[PDB]
Curated annotation (Swiss-Prot):
Negative regulator of cell death and defense responses. Negative regulator of several R genes, including SNC1. May have effects in promoting growth and development. May function in membrane trafficking and in fusion of vesicles with plasma membrane at low temperature. Exhibits calcium-dependent phospholipid binding properties. This is Protein BONZAI 1. Residues 10-121 form the C2 domain. Disulfide bonds: none annotated. Interacts (via VWA domain) with BAP1 and BAP2. Interacts with HSP70-1 and HSP70-2. Changing D33A: No effect. Loss of function. Loss of function, but no effect on targeting. Expressed in roots and flowers and, at higher levels, in leaves and stems. Strongly expressed in growing tissues. Not detected in green siliques. The gene is BON1. Overexpression of BON1 has no effects on pathogen resistance. Belongs to the copine family. Based on mass spectrometry analysis, the N-peptide must be modified and there might be additional modifications other than myristoylation. It is found in: Cell membrane. The N-terminus (1-116) is sufficient for plasma membrane localization. VWA domain fragments interfere with the function of the full-length protein, triggering a lesion-mimic phenotype.
Amino acid sequence: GTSSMADIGSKISTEIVFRCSNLESKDLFSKSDPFLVVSKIVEHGTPIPVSKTEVRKNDLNPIWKPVFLSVQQVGSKDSPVIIECSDFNSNGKHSLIGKVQKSLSDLEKLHLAGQGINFSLPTGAGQNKVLKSQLFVDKFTETV
């Protein structure tokens, strides 16, 4: 064929099934309607959304349909991307449930180890707040 090792790396499409455990719920607050957004980090800018899941209504332990991520969407398999879980609101201002910063390589390791990553929230005092809720990688498949 016509593909070097680096060319094959550049052509890899990654299929990922994401799951969350124990999204927060408090009395007097409507249950979350969560979705995930995967965003590419860019110099001097706002992360660029490259993939989003469907919304799952009223679900604190969502499992979403697969997402497909290219190398062009993430930069490279080792490049960190942002993965944020948000609560979909009809008014269109979606509230942050939690953030993770992981590369595709890191998501594959969570899948292989059967381990989750705790969400966190960026704070206005001290370090990020680490939540009890977790993101898991139920499926991680590469194809050319």
